[PDB]
Amino acid sequence: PVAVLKKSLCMVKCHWKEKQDYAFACEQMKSIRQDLTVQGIRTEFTVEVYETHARIALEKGDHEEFNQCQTQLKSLYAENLPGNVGEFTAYRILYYIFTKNSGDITTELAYLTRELKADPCVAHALALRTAWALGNYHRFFRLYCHAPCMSGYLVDKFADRERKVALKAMIKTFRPALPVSYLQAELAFEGEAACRAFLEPLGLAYTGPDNSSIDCRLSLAQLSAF
Amino acid sequence: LLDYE
Amino acid sequence: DEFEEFPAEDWAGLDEDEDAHVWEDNWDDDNVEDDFSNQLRAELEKHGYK
Amino acid sequence: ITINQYLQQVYEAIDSRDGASCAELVSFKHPHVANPRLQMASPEEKCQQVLEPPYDEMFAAHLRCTYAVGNHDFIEAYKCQTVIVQSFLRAFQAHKEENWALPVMYAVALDLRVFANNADQQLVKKGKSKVGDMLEKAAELLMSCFRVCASDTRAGIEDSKKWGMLFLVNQLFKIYFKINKLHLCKPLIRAIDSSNLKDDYSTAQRVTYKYYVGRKAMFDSDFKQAEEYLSFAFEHCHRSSQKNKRMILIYLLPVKMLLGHMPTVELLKKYHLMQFAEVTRAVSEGNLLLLHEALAKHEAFFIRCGIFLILEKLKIITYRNLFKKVYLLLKTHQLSLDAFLVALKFMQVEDVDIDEVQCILANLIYMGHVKGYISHQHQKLVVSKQNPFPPLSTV
């Protein structure tokens, strides 16, 4: 059952699109993948099914399943199989940023060709990697706002970590007070409630009951807490 | 403005 | 390529090519009158900042 | 030379416990490999009747291996060399409180690694397997050799097998640097440090170990230790082996530049590493445009060397130097951020806004490169009266 398995993949794609249930979709696609492995199929359709499973896993946020999918999909791409090579070359860099695998990023960038770098997803991933490496949180979050395809789901995993690092760097410099509005604008926050909920658990001391701004000088001691 | 300390 | 294999396993210090003062740390100073700094000063002066 | 004479020489060297002659008779650097009489297909009977085991199997495997390399059968050569290493390690652990056969190991070990590479290359040309198939087996065998050498704790240091430790480690490092597996170097690095002979090894092996550990530390963002190791490796490198000195400079230059030491033009020209020249000229000047142009023009060289992402971290030093130039030109402790915005736009950086200037200054102050604070309401960086930009060495 190889030819009709494409129709089965279409069915499970529709199931994910409408029902939006990760359990059955993931189980059925894992069974499909294990059926493909048994028959030894390594054609373009294998690339298609692996891409679909990785894209589905990204939406649910399960990075481990996506990690396995991209690890196998690198091997699938190694044999010059047609597909969205740029889209999933971007996700490799994004996952390497997420896991802080600085060693893997060098090797991944070494094999990049001009066609891949011309791809919008790879260009966005490379710019985000540069911003993260240089600690440029403004450009980092500007790129994180307008992220192409599924590239934003990877960045949503270390967005909180980079936000904490950026807030440490902001409190260390911005004196005598750091406006919360500037904090929510620079750190790519939607709504004031999200930013307030982000900086509440840190225990930072603010400037007055209105909490119009956070007091950096009295919050320097709380930097080690987060 | 006050200088950095 | 890769790191080679040394011909003699031990050579004491006479075979150590000593390079003298190949590293400079005096570049970091108040020297601001070179060509690039003059160009940057002109660019800044175009927008004020005497 | 008849093979009978070769077998007699092997037996005499083995019985006399002379490591040098036995190592020469089994190493491919010896001219006896090129001798047509030496190369034979199945000399196993001669080795069996002349040498006691396990030396008989080892030298029969060596003879068929030199025959294979004469016929360029590198897979058969690698299999024979693995047989050689196994038999020799058996006969080597056989020796108690004696390390006469230590030189032999060296030669044998080296040969194995070399053959492995060719074997892998053969499997690349044949298309059967990928790159690094035999290198992992080579590393496993060398790790077994290292375990045997480091297990000799009871024997006295004068005749201990620990003297054969560092060399093996270096060999492993080479494999671990060709298949891009740095983490596997973590145990060996501590294993050498645990030993009390960390500074009693030969100059060549110590230099190679220092260079490899410095490379690993640099790849792990440990530039202080990386400099402390690579400076020793580059200072004590052999004058004749200029390729090794250049290879050490390739990885020592980024660390020295990141820590605030800039190489001279004479050093780069002498070792033909002119690719760094323009890059250096940017960092000491604060020229971001020149740094971008030099990194793009020599992108291929740095990508091949594997230090492109380490080199891109010089952008922080370039920012610090440019902002120091701005501070010196303005001669004011309270600098408006618009001056830094103008300086950044002068460097033709894409879509710069005052927010990016604030972000860059905040990162610099957090990293300790700047001693100041940015008042956001007035949009002014107030910098310290004393020590505004501390030296990069202290940072």
Residue numbers in the entry:
A (entry chain A): 575 to 800
B (entry chain D): 10 to 14
C (entry chain C): 17 to 66
D (entry chain B): 4 to 398
What do the study authors state?
The DEAD-box ATPase DDX39B (also known as UAP56) is a multifunctional regulator of nuclear mRNPs. DDX39B contains an N-terminal motif (NTM) and two RecA-like domains (RecA1 and RecA2) that form the ATPase core.
A 3.08 Å cryo-EM map of TREX-2.1/DDX39BNTM-N complex reveals an asymmetric V-shaped architecture of TREX-2.1 and that the NTM-N of DDX39B binds to the LENG8/PCID2 interface. The LENG8 subunit forms the shorter leg of the V-shape, and the PCID2/DSS1 subcomplex forms the longer leg, with a buried surface area of 1362 Å2 between them. The WH domains within the PCI fold of LENG8 and PCID2 mediate the primary interactions for the TREX-2.1 complex assembly (top). Key LENG8 residues at the interface involve Y711, A743, F748, and Y756. Comparison of the TREX-2M and TREX-2.1 structures shows that they resemble each other in terms of the overall architecture, but LENG8 features two major differences from GANP. First, LENG8 is significantly shorter than GANP, with the lack of a GANP N-terminal region (GANPN) that is involved in DDX39B–RecA1 interaction. Comparison of the TREX-2.1/DDX39BNTM-N and the TREX-2.1/DDX39BNTM+RecA1 structures reveals the structural flexibility of LENG8.
